[PDB]
Write a protein that binds this ligand. Sequence first.
Ligand code: NA
Length: 247
Amino acid sequence: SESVPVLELFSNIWGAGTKTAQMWYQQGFRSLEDIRSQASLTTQQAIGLKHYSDFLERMPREEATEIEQTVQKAAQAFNSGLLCVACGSYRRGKATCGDVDVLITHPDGRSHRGIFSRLLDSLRQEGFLTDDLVSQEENGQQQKYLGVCRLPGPGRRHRRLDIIVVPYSEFACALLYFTGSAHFNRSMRALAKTKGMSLSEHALSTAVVRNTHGCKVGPGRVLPTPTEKDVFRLLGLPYREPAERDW
DNA sequence: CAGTAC
DNA sequence: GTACTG
Ligand code: NA
C-alpha cells in the first residue's frame, strides 16, 4: 500500500517505532505477514505481532478492575497487608483503558520485598500471564514488570499489564507517576525544575543544583512525601484528584 | 540510538 | 521530564 499507511501498520506493533517501521519498509515489507515471515524480531516484537489485533483494542473499565483483582488476590495470598492499586487512566476514571498498571506496596515498609518474583510466578501458574515483555530489577528499590495477560473465560482478549512493587516510603511519588497523565507528569516535573527541585517516580527533591546551561549537576535532599497531597503542597500547587490530571 | 512507561 | 531495557 501507500507509505504512510504501512508505516502506521508497522508502528502499531509493540516494540517497533518509527525507525524500525521505515527499515522494514525499505526491505520491501508491506504487510504483517511479510513481517512475521521475513523480518528479524526481538522477543518482545514477536509478542506484539502475535497479539497485534488484541493490543489495538481498549477494554471496559470493568475489565481493568477484574485484572487488578486478579493481581491483588495473588499478592495477598502472600501477604494481605499488601496494598494493590490500579493506576493509569483507570485511576483517572476513564471509561476505557488501553492497558492496566498495578501498583503494589506494603504499609509496614518492609514486606513489599520478595513479593515481585513470587507474584509473577504465581500468576504464570494460573495461566494469567501469557507472555513477558520486560522486567526491571535495576531501578533502586522499585521492581517493574511489563507483560501480557488474559482473564479466564471464552472470548477474552490478551491485555497489556504492568506490575510495579515500590517501598511505602516512595508510594506517593510512584503513585503520581503511574496515575499520570504523561502530559501531567511533564508539567509537574518541569514546574519542580523551575523551583530548583526535581521530581521522579522515586521522590521529590529540593536544593537541586543546576549549572549555567540548565543541566543537573547535584541532586538535592529528598523531601518526605507520605501522601500525594504533600507533593502538590510542597510545589505550591492546589491538589488535584486523579480525574483532574488527565491532560 | 530506539522504544517504552506515565 | 525523568528514566528503564532492547
Ligand atoms: Na509501537
